[PDB]
């Protein structure tokens, strides 16, 4: 019978395993199984070579086979437990080890390994008990939208969790011509959906503009919708044929600012691919307080609305890159020329911007004429002339940078050795400039900033 050579094969293979000749052990073990498909011992010792070589997939397999093949192979359960510990299968390891020890009390024991299993599972159970830190109950838990309490005092259409109809959005723009506001359940429901989409968008936005396609780019709005009312009506409504990019600064000041983000966040749901919103540099709780936006919210709504707006706002991106050739930022240049695109993808959102590092280079850098580099203040470490940008633009293959921090006479300027440009949406921004405004027009075939001149001055 074939057992005569299976004995030699298993013997030679155990001797190869002891001699660290693992391939030869596995081959002669396989051959011993080829002569006896059902000896549980062969699958047992074969699984031990698969512990030793970390060939764990067949440690698990052949340990299971050894035990299925003989339910009374006690030392098979023991070797399965050895596989389980190597691999973290702790409950199975306890049960296998318990059985073995009660059957075989010893001094060079299975029981030190059982006590290691005991000590490990004891601490892991304690850790499962003291564990909070799955702690993220939602701002809107108990689903405040489905509490009904609908009013329609505004005669407002129902706005579903599906994309807000353009017809209402046109009506909403009319509700701003008429100083009229959304109902609360719809407003909560859009803020929930806005969170859900925005929190998944990349922290640096990447878009390819085809040669035949043109983008209109927008800057600081100071929370006045009148200017965007007009550009949407003037340059085409922000539909798929008007893939606008907005350089933030909406809660920059409060005047219609709730109403501004409330419409922008409406349009963002209907055309998310075409309509792109960045965070502005005057935008944190610190300024939401100073310019009374927090008060507008607390006047129009109970304070939990401000917690939801905080959550929603915290997901805004800082930057966008067009074709890998034009980079849109708020403030200006990075503290060093070595800043690398995947390292920008590794910037951590769900925090306030710092006064140092890439996030307040992006928001509070502030480009100069003169060559070099500034020192830490103003939400910052550094601000710049041309020289670092020559070397930065060479890393990433960029042409020039877009900024929105500073007012300029025609609504824009091309500056910084010709390697940077200005834009913003509000004409007569402040006590500080009575500027005209403009929108940059960019073609995939021609990225030299082209402009729309905006003289429609509110106030």
């Amino acid at each position: 019978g074939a057992l005569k050579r299976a004995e030699e094969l298993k013997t030679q293979a155990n001797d190869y395993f002891k001699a660290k000749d693992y391939e030869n052990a596995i081959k002669f073990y396989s051959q011993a199984i080829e002569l006896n498909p059902s000896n549980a011992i062969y699958y047992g010792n074969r699984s031990l070579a698969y512990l030793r070589t970390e060939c764990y997939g067949y440690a698990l397999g052949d340990a299971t086979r050894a035990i299925e093949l003989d339910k009374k192979y006690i030392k098979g359960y023991y070797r399965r437990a050895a596989s389980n510990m190597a691999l973290g299968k702790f409950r199975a390891a306890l049960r296998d080890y318990e059985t073995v020890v009660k059957v075989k009390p010893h001094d060079k024991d299975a029981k030190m390994k059982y006590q290691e299993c005991n000590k490990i599972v004891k601490q892991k159970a304690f850790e499962r008990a003291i564990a909070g830190d799955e702690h993220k109950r939602s701002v809107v838990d108990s689903l405040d939208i489905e509490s009904m309490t609908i009013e329609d005092e505004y005669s407002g259409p129902k706005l579903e969790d599906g994309k807000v109809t353009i017809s209402f959005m046109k009506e909403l723009m009319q509700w701003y011509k008429d100083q009229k506001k959304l109902h609360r359940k719809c407003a909560y429901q859009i803020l929930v959906q806005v969170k859900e989409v925005l929190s998944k968008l990349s922290t640096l936005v990447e878009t390819t503009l085809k040669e035949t396609e043109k983008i209109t780019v927008c800057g600081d709005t100071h929370g006045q919708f009148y200017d965007l009312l007009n550009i949407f009506e003037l340059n085409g409504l922000p539909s798929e044929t008007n893939p606008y990019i907005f350089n933030g600064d909406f809660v920059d000041r409060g005047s219609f600012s709730v109403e501004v983000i409330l419409t922008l966040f409406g349009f963002k749901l209907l055309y998310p691919d075409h309509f792109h919103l960045l965070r502005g540099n005057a935008e944190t709780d610190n300024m939401n307080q100073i310019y009374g936006f927090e008060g507008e919210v607390k006047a129009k709504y109970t304070a939990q609305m401000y917690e939801l707006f905080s959550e929603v706002f915290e997901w805004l991106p800082l930057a966008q890159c067009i074709n890998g050739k034009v980079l849109i930022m708020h403030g200006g240049l990075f503290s060093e020329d070595g800043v690398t695109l995947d390292d920008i993808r590794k910037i951590e959102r769900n925090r306030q911007p710092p006064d140092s590092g890439p996030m307040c280079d992006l928001l509070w850098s502030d480009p100069q004429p003169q060559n070099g580099r500034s020192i830490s203040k103003r939400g910052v470490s550094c601000q710049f002339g041309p020289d670092v940008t020559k070397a930065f633009l060479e890393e990433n293959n960029l042409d020039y940078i877009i900024r929105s921090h500073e007012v300029k006479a025609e609504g824009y300027e091309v500056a910084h050795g010709g390697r940077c440009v200005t834009v913003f949406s509000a004409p007569n921004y402040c006590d500080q400039m009575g500027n005209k405004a403009s929108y940059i027009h960019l073609q995939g075939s021609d990225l030299r900033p082209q402009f729309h001149q905006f003289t429609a001055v509110p106030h």
Partner: peptide
């Protein structure tokens, strides 16, 4: 849970520091 204070908060915390020591395996 019900809003009562403890007559002495130390005995209560000691029961906690014992469970913590057993859970960690300190003693």
């Amino acid at each position: 849970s019900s809003g009562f204070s403890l007559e002495d908060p130390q005995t209560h915390s000691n029961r906690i520091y014992r469970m913590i020591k057993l859970g960690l395996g300190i003693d």
